[PDB]
Design a protein around this ligand. Structure first.
Ligand SMILES: *S(=O)(=O)c1ccc(C(=O)NCCCn2c(=O)n(CCC)c(=O)c3[nH]c(C4CCCCC4)nc32)cc1
Ligand SMILES: *S(=O)(=O)c1ccc(C(=O)NCCCn2c(=O)n(CCC)c(=O)c3[nH]c(C4CCCCC4)nc32)cc1
Ligand SMILES: CCCCCCCC/C=C/CCCCCCCC(=O)O
Ligand SMILES: CCCCCCCC/C=C\CCCCCCCC(=O)O
Ligand SMILES: CCCCCCCC/C=C\CCCCCCCC(=O)O
Ligand SMILES: CCCCCCCC/C=C\CCCCCCCC(=O)O
Ligand SMILES: CCCCCCCC/C=C\CCCCCCCC(=O)O
Ligand SMILES: CCCCCCCC/C=C\CCCCCCCC(=O)O
Ligand SMILES: CCCCCCCC/C=C\CCCCCCCC(=O)O
Lengths: 383, 384
């Protein structure tokens, strides 16, 4: 009794935290034009899936818990929404990971590559494939034949009426081989790899800017204290090459022009005059080049900042979801093994609970959601 | 071992669905892309289209599956019967919204934009669907023949839930269909809409009549003429040109009137010639633009009315059939009359897109653009 009330209460509480948060996430993206980006469009899809868990999956579980025995088909139908919705989440996250990859990987062609319509197609695909994976049990892959044998062996007519249990209607072979090994693990590992790559790229790109910045300062010391024009030329050419790398506009025009005006001397062989260019290059550097460096730093570090937040979401997803899979694997491979009910129950509470986390982590980590949620709260949900 | 009649039913259903789904998807497409259709009326036409897409994509397939399929549990047949009830109810309320929107424009044109706002239109839409789900899901809450079938199942002497040939009249209560759905949730909306449109026409025809009255008053027409011209003027980027056309006119009417106090006709003819120049210079624009904008209000109203007429004409037979089955269970009614009634209702989901294309100019131009830009296969036309 009190345990059932506790289950129902915890479920109700998880649902009560889940639904408003994700509705608020979906709200936040619609109102705010600063969140009109591919990443956020997938966060809306991911939020929608979480709203569906709290609004549909958790109520069904409670209704099945408090309810009577059901037909096989009834229990089979009720088992699928969570399979669809959980699958949608994974693909939605994978979309976010590849979107995060593409930005840093192909920044010049990003806007022409990743377009709203393509993002929409990608979204639609996730849901289509999610319905495909989640409805597979409805097509036939289940224990119907296994239960019909026991129903006839017991000697009962018509469709099997049973206590609605997941393991009674959904095939563990399906859950382990099809769902987990094909449709969970490879996306997870691929995403885990993609993020490592995303960090690797950003850290290297940050390193390259500091490399170019230090190269440009280091060679000014070489030019200012050089004996032979050959030393100055070797500095100037590397400074130029560094400037052409750093450019990948008009500050760089003015700089590279002054490097050419310096270089022009080095062909004749006059060091004295080359010091006059060096003083101007320092003026150009401080006039123009600091801006590019600082803005590149800030915009790269902003790419880094989000990546961590989006990674944390993946970590939380994986950490929330892996237990219930491990449980499905150990039940399949070791049916002889006993596994305590509390471990089963906390695993299930973690999965439903995962629908509450995203809105909370967005509020804590992502600045633009924080400012919006406050505005929505103040303007609409304030006492 | 399938009957040619069954094949014909399935084929006609499939064809109706094949005409219905693309048309309404194209209607929903047309409103989204075109900013000229970003108006309250069209926002209800999207909701009405969505309902029709659902008939062709969900209701017609379910009917075919039930037709070709086996006997079902009572609950299965009860569940499958409801979507059409929801969707049909949505249509009526969506049309009623359109009727009152058409009324409000002509009734309160000055305050229309401040009254009928996007959010209010959205709330109104949402309401239609909520109430539609309420009316349509009522049978799922309990109002059905379950107890009536359970008696016969036990009387036959069979255990468990009733398995039966899935028929509408076997699971849905006729009392519900006649008293609740038809008498409360169909007829009053229909009659109210029928009244609203008559009023909408009445207003527009009178407003058109008044402009021609003022125009004819001005052209027929010293004091008795001038006072009527004045009275007509008081009744009567661009607003500046109208304002100033009226300044130039009323100024010349004052310059004419100035003579009438003294009493000199000869000179007043000099003003009359200038007033005709002012009329043809400025006043024709106001008249013609008012004519065009009023006649555009008239043009849509007829199209939207035709949709109501077609809806009522498509839907009333199946209701009459439900009433006569309820009140006269002894009465025999031929199957063809039952079948054409049912074909009409599913068919109604195909009509709206077709009538929009024929009558409404802005949908016609859009459907062509969507066809050309997305669904064109010109190399087949070149291939011929
Ligand atoms: S209690 O023991 O009475 C009890 C009451 C209610 C519930 C419950 O809410 N169950 C819903 C979760 C069912 N379920 C799944 O939905 N999935 C799919 C996830 C996408 C599973 O993979 C799953 N595995 C299991 C168990 C776990 C270990 C024991 C055998 C399978 N349940 C799953 C539960 C208990
Ligand atoms: S044939 O006789 O085998 C046959 C095959 C298939 C169908 C069929 O597709 N029927 C679907 C229509 C069911 N139906 C409704 O949906 N509604 C609700 C409208 C919003 C009705 O009101 C309704 N009334 C009836 C009949 C009418 C005459 C006999 C009594 C009930 N069916 C309705 C049909 C036949
Ligand atoms: C018993 C199952 C019933 C199935 C009904 C299927 C239809 C589902 C309803 C969806 C709501 C559609 C809302 C459309 C609003 C359009 C708003 C707009 O014009 O922008
Ligand atoms: C939210 C409001 C209540 C949540 C707790 C409800 C628990 C009911 C327990 C009764 C039972 O055992 O079925
Ligand atoms: C067996 C029945 C399964 C029912 C599953 C429930 C799913 C309901 C929730 C969402 C489905 C529609 C997907 C819409 C995605 C829109 C995301 C976006 O706005 O980008
Ligand atoms: C056998 C497999 C069954 C497949 C059923 C199809 C399910 C499709 C569900 C939802 C499609 C719409 C998703 C929303 C796409 C729009 C994305 C956007 O523009 O934001
Ligand atoms: C669109 C097609 C509509 C109707 C097709 C009807 C085909 C009838 C062939 C029946 C053959 C038979 O079963 O004997
Ligand atoms: C027009 C009407 C011709 C189609 C008549 C359909 C009868 C179907 C009979 C059946 O399905 O058994
Ligand atoms: C009978 C009790 C159950 C009631 C359930 C009602 C389900 C409501 C479903 C959809 C309503 C939301 C429609 C959104 C309309 C959007 C309008 C707009 O913004 O254009």
């Amino acid at each position: 009794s009190a345990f059932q009330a506790a289950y129902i209460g915890i479920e109700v509480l998880i649902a009560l935290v889940s639904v408003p948060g994700n509705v608020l996430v979906i709200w936040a993206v619609k109102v705010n034009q600063a969140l009109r980006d591919a990443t956020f469009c997938f966060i809306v899809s991911l939020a929608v899936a979480d709203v569906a868990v709290g609004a549909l999956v958790i109520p069904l579980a409670i209704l099945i818990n408090i309810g009577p025995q059901t037909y096989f088909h009834t229990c089979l139908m009720v088992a699928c929404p969570v399979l669809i919705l959980t699958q949608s989440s994974i693909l939605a996250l994978l979309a976010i990971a590849v979107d995060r990859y593409l930005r840093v990987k192909i920044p010049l062609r990003y806007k022409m590559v990743v377009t709203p319509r393509r993002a929409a197609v990608a979204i639609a695909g996730c849901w289509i494939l999610s319905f495909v994976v989640g409805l597979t049990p409805m097509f036939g892959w289940n224990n119907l034949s296994a239960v019909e044998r026991a129903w006839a062996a017991a000697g009962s007519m018509g469709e099997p009426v049973i206590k609605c249990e997941f393991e009674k209607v959904i095939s563990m072979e399906y859950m382990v081989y099809f769902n987990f090994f094909v449709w969970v693990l490879p996306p997870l590992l691929l995403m885990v790899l993609i993020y490592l790559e995303v960090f690797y790229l950003i850290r290297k790109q940050l390193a390259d800017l500091e490399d170019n910045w230090e190269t440009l300062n280091d060679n000014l010391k070489v030019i200012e204290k050089a004996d032979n024009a050959a030393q100055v030329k070797d500095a100037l050419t590397k400074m130029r090459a560094a400037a052409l790398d750093a450019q990948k506009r008009h500050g760089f025009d003015i700089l590279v022009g002054q490097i050419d005006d310096a270089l022009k001397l080095a062909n004749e062989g006059k060091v004295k005059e080359a010091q006059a260019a060096a003083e101007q290059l320092k003026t150009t550097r401080n006039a123009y080049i600091q801006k590019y460096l600082e803005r590149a730093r800030s915009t790269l570090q902003k790419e880094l900042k989000i990546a961590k937040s989006l990674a944390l979401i993946l970590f939380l997803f994986a950490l929330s979801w892996l237990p219930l899979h491990i449980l499905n694997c150990i039940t399949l491979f070791c049916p002889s093994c006993h596994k305590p009910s509390i471990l089963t129950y906390i695993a299930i509470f973690l999965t439903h609970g995962n629908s509450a986390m995203n809105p909370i982590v967005y509020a804590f980590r992502i600045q633009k959601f924080r400012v919006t949620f406050l505005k929505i709260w103040n303007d609409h949900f304030r006492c």
